[PDB]
Design a protein around this ligand. Structure first.
Ligand code: HEM
Ligand code: HEM
Ligand code: HEM
Ligand code: HEM
Lengths: 146, 141, 146, 141
């Protein structure tokens, strides 16, 4: 995707300060709390009955780290997001049956989670660059659906 | 909010649909699966080929519930209560997808009701399906 | 955009039967009727008070003809929609201030008009090819927004 | 539908916002204009640069209306009646845009209230803004 030099730099500098396991556990947990119908994919994960149970469930934290891990690897290949997520796009469609609209919901909770963690350093301009990236990633993941 | 003219328009258009409601419900699901392929992620357990009995039974269940809401249009939350419960707690369809079915139902109705599908009835039908969608997703959270 | 050869042929054979002025006035009229907030742009067009007054408004019908004639010419350039609608994209964003969401609404009303017009000829696979076309056109028109 | 716990959460979070509400409203509009550039088509008459008083004025007006909604949370349709009329028949903002400002509000809240923006309060606030959005577009057709 086309990112200005200023947007690429903003995305990359902030991401160097992120602890990918913690932020991944938070983002996934908040997705399951704020949009509870997303729990239809995680029936085998244990107690998801309340916010505290969601946020403390170790299966939610281990999945979150996995998800953001592969997201993190996509930030190294911003010029070819489609080629980078092709394999995982096909997996999410043919084996997991995950509606791509959930990629968009997660991209917006992730932005909320960065703002909550970094405060006034997550400025308007920097949120703009991350909104383009999460929309680009959601796009790449839904690309092989059929 | 459905006005009285909306309610009259919906009761007339659906009255004409009549005994084909079930066949129209199946065709709208088939139109949705081909135009908007991500909606097939909610039906992995179905044979989705043209004319499949599974699609024909889903089309007939949805038509019946539409008929019930037209009959109880002034009291829809109470009449669709069990359906909203099932969608919110068991099926958990993302609420984006309701707009896609609605559009496909409208295209189905257009294609079958040349004389009745006027601009004002089109407007009323679109508003009625948005309200049915709202009621069906009211208990999601 | 990528349409299979079957989809392109389905799109082109139907459209050879369309009366562009008739359908254009019908599609724009019904847009203004079913989604009344889109009337914000047309306050100089006269009486928009009731469905019959929109549908019979000569200025609505003239604007429709113009909008659908440009659409029609894009159908000849299905491999390069972005390049075809680039200057119109800029005009809608910098001078007309038209929220691109309007394009998507018009594309869905246009699909309902074609089904009403052609009845059983407008089959599920014909609808699928036209949905891809209207979403491609809406994306091309929103391309230069900034 | 807002539960008793949701209403309690919103009053608490909005209470801490307090006298900054106007500043948070302007920041949310600025976040919205940079992240979702199509939303600038509704303010062609404004100076949209960072720090604009026109943007600050709009942020203060929107903040005051949400304060009024929080204060009348069990009677929202009546308290926001005039605002609903105004968006429906003169501003005519397409509905999609209401979800874009609501997300930017949330982002603004998270960035400024790191102790109060818990998962539970994040869920209640999102439900609260969807409800304000629904009330504001209630009279569109
Ligand atoms: C940024 C977007 C996402 C990325 C990059 C991503 C990545 C991954 C990866 C790397 C796996 C592991 C595959 C394996 O070997 O089994 C996976 C599995 C999975 N993902 Fe995605 N994911 C994303 C978003 C989501 C969302 C939003 C959902 C659902 C709401 C989801 C549902 C799943 C499920 C159900 C699995 C299987 C977990 C299991 O084994 O039970 N993913 N994903
Ligand atoms: C007008 C809106 C809709 C209505 C009135 C409706 C109504 C119904 C009804 C009556 C049933 C059968 C319940 C039973 O067996 O007790 C059903 C099931 C189901 N619906 Fe909904 N539905 C609507 C929209 C949707 C949408 C948009 C989707 C997905 C994209 C969806 C997916 C399903 C699924 C997956 C089932 C269960 C199928 C099975 O396993 O038999 N529905 N719906
Ligand atoms: C396929 C979708 C559309 C196409 C192809 C299209 C094309 C055009 C064209 C060719 C013009 C005249 C260009 C000129 O004067 O240089 C125009 C102008 C205009 N368009 Fe669009 N348009 C589309 C959708 C829309 C929509 C949905 C709206 C608003 C609801 C809109 C609002 C306008 C307005 C207000 C004008 C100026 C008219 C005048 O000055 O009389 N257009 N458009
Ligand atoms: C919580 C959601 C919203 C609330 C509470 C709200 C409330 C208000 C209020 C109180 C006013 C000022 C009315 C007056 O002059 O007395 C206003 C004006 C306006 N709003 Fe909304 N609004 C919301 C969302 C939006 C959105 C999403 C948009 C478009 C992207 C929008 C566009 C406008 C515009 C263009 C004006 C008039 C600006 C002017 O002075 O020229 N509003 N709104």
């Amino acid at each position: 995707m086309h990112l200005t030099p200023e947007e690429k730099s903003a995305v990359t500098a902030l991401w160097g300060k992120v602890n990918v396991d913690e932020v991944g556990g938070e983002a996934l947990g908040r997705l399951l709390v704020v949009y509870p119908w997303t729990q239809r994919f995680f029936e085998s994960f244990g107690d998801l009955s309340t916010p505290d149970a969601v946020m403390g469930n170790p299966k939610v934290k281990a999945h979150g780290k996995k998800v953001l891990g592969a997201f993190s690897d996509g930030l190294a290949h911003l010029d070819n997001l489609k080629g980078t997520f092709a394999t995982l796009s096909e997996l999410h469609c043919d084996k997991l049956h995950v509606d791509p609209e959930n990629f968009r919901l997660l991209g917006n909770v992730l932005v909320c989670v960065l703002a909550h963690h970094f405060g006034k350093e997550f400025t308007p301009p920097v949120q703009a660059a991350y909104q383009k990236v999460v929309a680009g990633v959601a796009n790449a993941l839904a690309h092989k659906y059929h | 909010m459905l006005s009285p003219a909306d309610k009259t328009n919906v009761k007339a258009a659906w009255g004409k649909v009549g005994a084909h409601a079930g066949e129209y419900g199946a065709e709208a699901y088939e139109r949705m699966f081909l135009s908007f392929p991500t909606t097939k992620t909610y039906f992995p357990h179905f044979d989705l080929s043209h004319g499949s009995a599974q699609v024909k039974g889903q089309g007939k269940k949805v038509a019946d519930a539409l008929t019930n809401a037209v009959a109880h249009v002034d009291d829809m939350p109470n009449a669709l209560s069990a359906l909203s419960d099932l969608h919110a707690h068991k099926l958990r369809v993302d609420p984006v997808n309701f707009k896609l079915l609605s559009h496909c139902l409208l295209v189905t109705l257009a294609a079958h009701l040349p004389a009745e599908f006027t601009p004002a009835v089109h407007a009323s039908l679109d508003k009625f399906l948005a309200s049915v969608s709202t009621v069906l997703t009211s208990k999601y959270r």
